[PDB]
Symmetry: C3
Subunit: 101 residues, 3 copies
């Protein structure tokens, strides 16, 4: 298994493309996005991104860039969880996530 | 970053308003909810609720499970998280960036 | 609360039924699945499974069987998180989750 940080961004859908580009620019290998409802008839339609990064610093770069640019004007939350990646050709590279010495 | 508990509730879609009302009464500052499938495929719902304290998460969990989960299908679990940005979650005080 | 392992599988939607068969065959008590979008405009419709297991080996058996059968030919990521289950009759049994 490979150590990973899982960054979650829940925010307004209008920010989809701008947050996707930030993610791409960060060096993150991929991301998952989903339509969600949220509250912070009072529910609103939101999107949630999940991004697995190899380092906490990469996760924080994305979080910091999204927030500084958009979180004054747009609703949002960003949080981070620990995870271990078991399989993922781009995340772990060709030798896989359980390579030996 | 501010320590958080991420409470997740996966249950029958018909309980959406009922469960949102409990979350709204709890003191939690928000919630995300999404349409999902499952078995435990039926179309159901998943809530995620970030709370500042484990105690708030567990009060939500207890209230929801006792009121509904002997009569409706449901699972409730909790994960650790850290909040990096969140105006209402961390307050005007911010997410204590240097801790 | 009962310690649990949260296995996540994000992969191509066409594999929905093939993966669900594997989850069931592993002994897992259930799963959640949802429609997602992934990059890895260049977002393609895909699926995410979340599976809570009592043991780490059960989660890894699901992981190993899905990846070996499919990940040479289909895109995917599988990762794992700690969790605790608070309520869940099938997960915890009739005594509850403590
Ligand atoms: N405490 C929380 N727990 C879970 N989700 C949250 C929390 N606070 C805010 N959110 C999500 O972040 C979203 C921000 O935009 P909305 O307020 O439309 O809806 C909010 C919720 O979906
Ligand atoms: N062990 C598990 N892992 C992930 N999801 C679960 C598990 N057990 C139950 N569920 C989810 O919780 C839901 C409760 O309603 P269902 O029985 O319709 O469908 C269930 C699944 O989506
Ligand atoms: N680093 C990552 N973080 C979050 N999700 C990812 C990551 N890499 C791949 N994925 C997801 O795994 C999916 C595999 O199928 P796709 O390429 O269609 O889209 C991919 C993303 O949804």
């Amino acid at each position: 298994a490979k150590p990973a940080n899982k960054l979650v961004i829940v925010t307004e859908k209008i920010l989809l493309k701008k947050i996707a580009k930030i993610i791409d620019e960060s060096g993150a290998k991929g991301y998952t996005v989903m339509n969600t409802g949220g509250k912070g008839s009072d529910i609103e339609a939101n999107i949630k991104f999940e991004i697995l990064t190899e380092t906490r610093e990469m996760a924080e770069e994305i979080a910091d860039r999204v927030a500084v640019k958009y979180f004054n004007d747009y609703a949002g939350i960003i949080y981070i969880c620990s995870a271990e990646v078991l399989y993922g050709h781009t995340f772990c590279g060709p030798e896989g996530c359980s390579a030996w010495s």
